[PDB]
Design a binder for this molecule. Sequence first.
Ligand SMILES: CCCCCCCCCCCCCCCCCC(=O)OC[C@H](CO[C@@H]1O[C@H](CO)[C@H](O)[C@H](O)[C@H]1O)OC(=O)CCCCCCCCCCCCCCCCC
Lengths: 101, 115, 57, 69, 164, 63
Amino acid sequence: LTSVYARTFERAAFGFAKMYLFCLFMRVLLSWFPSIDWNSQPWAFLRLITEPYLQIYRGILPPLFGQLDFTPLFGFLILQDVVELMSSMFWTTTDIMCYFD
Amino acid sequence: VYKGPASIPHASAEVFGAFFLATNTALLAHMFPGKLFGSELHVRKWDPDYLASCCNEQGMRREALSGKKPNLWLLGGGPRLVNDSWERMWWNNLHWKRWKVPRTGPAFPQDMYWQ
Amino acid sequence: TLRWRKTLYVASLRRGFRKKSRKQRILVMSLITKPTHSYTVLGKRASRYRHQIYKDV
Amino acid sequence: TVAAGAAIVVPSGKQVEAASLDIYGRPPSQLLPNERRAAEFAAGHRRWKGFVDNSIYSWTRTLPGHDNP
Amino acid sequence: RNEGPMTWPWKLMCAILYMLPWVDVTEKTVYFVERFPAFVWTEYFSEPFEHWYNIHEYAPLFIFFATYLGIVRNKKIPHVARYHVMMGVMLDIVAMILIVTEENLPTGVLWTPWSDLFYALMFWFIFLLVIYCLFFCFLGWYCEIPLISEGVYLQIEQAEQLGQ
Amino acid sequence: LIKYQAFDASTYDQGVYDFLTIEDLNYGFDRFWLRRKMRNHQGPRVEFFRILFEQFYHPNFHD
Ligand SMILES: CCCCCCCCCCCCCCCCCC(=O)OC[C@H](CO[C@@H]1O[C@H](CO)[C@H](O)[C@H](O)[C@H]1O)OC(=O)CCCCCCCCCCCCCCCCC
């Protein structure tokens, strides 16, 4: 039971994290476009689910230029990377276990 | 909102849209012959060698019926007056005829293979 | 052949030799002492077999 | 430069007769087209070497021997 | 505000800065050239550009900071040259977005020929954008890409007052 | 295949093949398997067979 549940939780967390990376990716890419309605439905929900996290960190980057923050992108990329880690390479011969996620 | 001095020409976005779609459609039409509503896309109507052979045929036939010795006109040019080799004497027509297969084309595969 | 495999790809070492001296194993419950260094699933031979199986699949 | 060089290079008829009569055994206007150009080139090259020898190299050889490597 | 035309040294500098996105997508050229051999010269053209853009790890970030702080905001340079510099930077960002996309493909798609189609389309789209912008840079004109050039105009007029 | 220009982009009747075969250059799983370092990310006992069973199912092995 514990192994199946642990694997399921890992997969679900990985999926949720990938989705949140997609959401942040969207935030950057739209931040390129200035004449948006951030109000209108679709935009409102995206901001919402990204509302608090960017609201966490709007005090480290000084208001040098109010136009854009890439910072969440590097942050969460490294975060899921550590998730891979905290959970070139010289081998004796070509390792097959490096083509797995 | 400032674009430029308006004396320097601006190309519209429709020009790039047509360029992008036309390049992609040309590649797709070259990969699949027979599926362009049952047809394919060619880059010419007649082979230049075919046209020149027809024109030489009619020219020497008209020369012969007028009571003269017929002359063949050569693509590329006539002979050089030298004395060291046959290939140097007839270099221009040889140079035209050596380029036959890439002039006919195409330089891409003629049939589709699925990798 | 071996000649063809030698002409395609070489190891390109850069950090010394990939192969190292072999470590004999003993079992806890002829004239020649036989090699038992590959009686493990973490060795070089198990890696080669596993790589071939992945390629077939 | 093109016309200024062509003033140095381009020979007259006497150089062309001179360059034809020693390289070949025959006087000009008795030759193939490719072997007329050899005589014309030899006359022009002789004019170039003569100009460089008497007009550029007569006063630049004052021997400041230095500046080796 | 300088409204004069481009002259030749600005055209040469802009052509090199346009060679930068080609360097960033040049790995995937084999997946397009295999099908269309007439473009095989694009396999070999960018090799010293690849060498010089990778002399140091911090070289392209230095290039981006130097161009943005010394060309785009400087109002004495003519406006069309700053337009072409910012176009090169935007095409570089688009290519880096494509690289980020290809490094997050799932493992099932990655072991199919769909990955080969994706690689070929990456190279071909960046190549088409680069060739179009280089043609209009050698002419000396403005070229308007959809969804890109309006941001370029806004960034130029924003970087300009980026002082007061 | 790092020492060679390991692709085939040949024209009309000019193809030449010497120890890099036609099938290795441009056919199928041979061509696909030679280019596998494009698709590396950048235990070995049990999880290998479980992941291969769940991900790449085929009845000639798994049925
Ligand atoms: C009589 C002498 C014979 C000379 C024949 C000369 C042929 C002239 C071809 C000139 C065109 C080549 C341009 C020079 C390329 C500069 C860079 C270069 O050297 O790269 C050198 C590279 C070759 O790269 C070399 O490759 C080697 C592989 O064996 C090695 O890898 C070497 O390291 C590498 O340097 O060549 C190119 O990439 C060629 C690309 C040429 C295509 C450019 C597209 C533009 C085409 C011209 C546009 C015309 C537009 C219409 C104009 C209308 C007027 C007709």
